[PDB]
């Protein structure tokens, strides 16, 4: 019952795409940002790229079909919807898994800071990254090809809720110390932006599964299209936190302009 002009979706998508392109090109063009913990921040950039590209393309297609220009063999629209609605179910499980991997790597380097170079090497990190993306690819397709059911929604709910518990545990550990003072402060922000942005949408579908026909909930979901602009704003914020908290990445950006 509320609407948002498509220009918002398109602009946010393009801007976040440019930011993530800059992050990945900066990592590759540099020779010191090749540590295995700095590749997970590239995999996260890829996940946010997926969200932005899919949303921009879906908006373009909806606006094109709405206008008086083509006819699209109804099966075909229902097919590209599932293509587009499936590079967001992948770029959610991938984001969750990558945040877990970053947190586990930081915990290993903070509490086991003796053989981190022996155990967590560059090649092993690459193997973990490719395994995570391969697994999340299947996870995000099985769900969307089987979305008519009710188990997928509740499974997503428990995934988000459990990762919320992990964030809370990490925070309560942050205030009781007994490298660490400044180590896990990044993954504390990156886990506090993902939750702040994917939370309004996520309880939106604990409601429709609990209180569909109820005059309170009904006027809650009625603002659905503005819980999706928040999902983009997680992808326009994440690359900024890397810039304002990692030093040598900033100096690389200076090389980008000159």
């Amino acid at each position: 019952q509320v609407f948002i002009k498509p220009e918002v979706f398109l602009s946010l998508g393009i801007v976040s795409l440019l930011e993530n392109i800059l992050v990945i090109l900066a990592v590759v063009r540099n020779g010191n940002l090749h540590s295995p913990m700095y590749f997970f921040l590239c995999s996260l950039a890829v996940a946010d790229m997926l969200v932005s590209v899919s949303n921009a393309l879906e908006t373009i297609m909806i606006a094109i079909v709405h206008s008086d220009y083509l006819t699209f063999e109804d099966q075909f629209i229902q097919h590209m919807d599932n293509i587009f609605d499936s590079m967001i179910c992948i770029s959610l499980v991938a984001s969750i898994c990558n945040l877990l991997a970053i947190a586990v790597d930081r915990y290993v380097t903070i509490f086991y800071a003796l053989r981190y170079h022996s155990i967590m090497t560059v090649r092993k990190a690459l193997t973990l990254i490719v395994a995570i993306w391969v697994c999340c690819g299947v996870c995000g397709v099985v769900f969307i090809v089987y979305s008519e059911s009710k188990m997928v929604i509740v499974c997503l709910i428990t995934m988000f809720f459990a990762m919320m518990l992990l964030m809370g545990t990490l925070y309560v550990h942050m205030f009781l110390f007994a490298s660490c003072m400044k180590g896990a402060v990044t993954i504390t922000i990156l886990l506090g932006v993902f939750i702040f942005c994917w939370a309004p949408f996520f309880l939106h579908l604990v409601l429709i599964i609990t209180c569909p026909t109820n005059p309170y909930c009904i006027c809650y979901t009625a603002h659905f299209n503005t819980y999706l602009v928040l999902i983009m704003c997680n992808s326009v914020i994440d690359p900024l936190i890397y810039a304002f908290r990692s030093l040598e990445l900033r100096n690389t950006f200076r090389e980008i302009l000159c």
Partner: peptide
């Protein structure tokens, strides 16, 4: 089609 899913 429509934006997001489970709207």
């Amino acid at each position: 089609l429509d934006h997001x899913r489970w709207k």
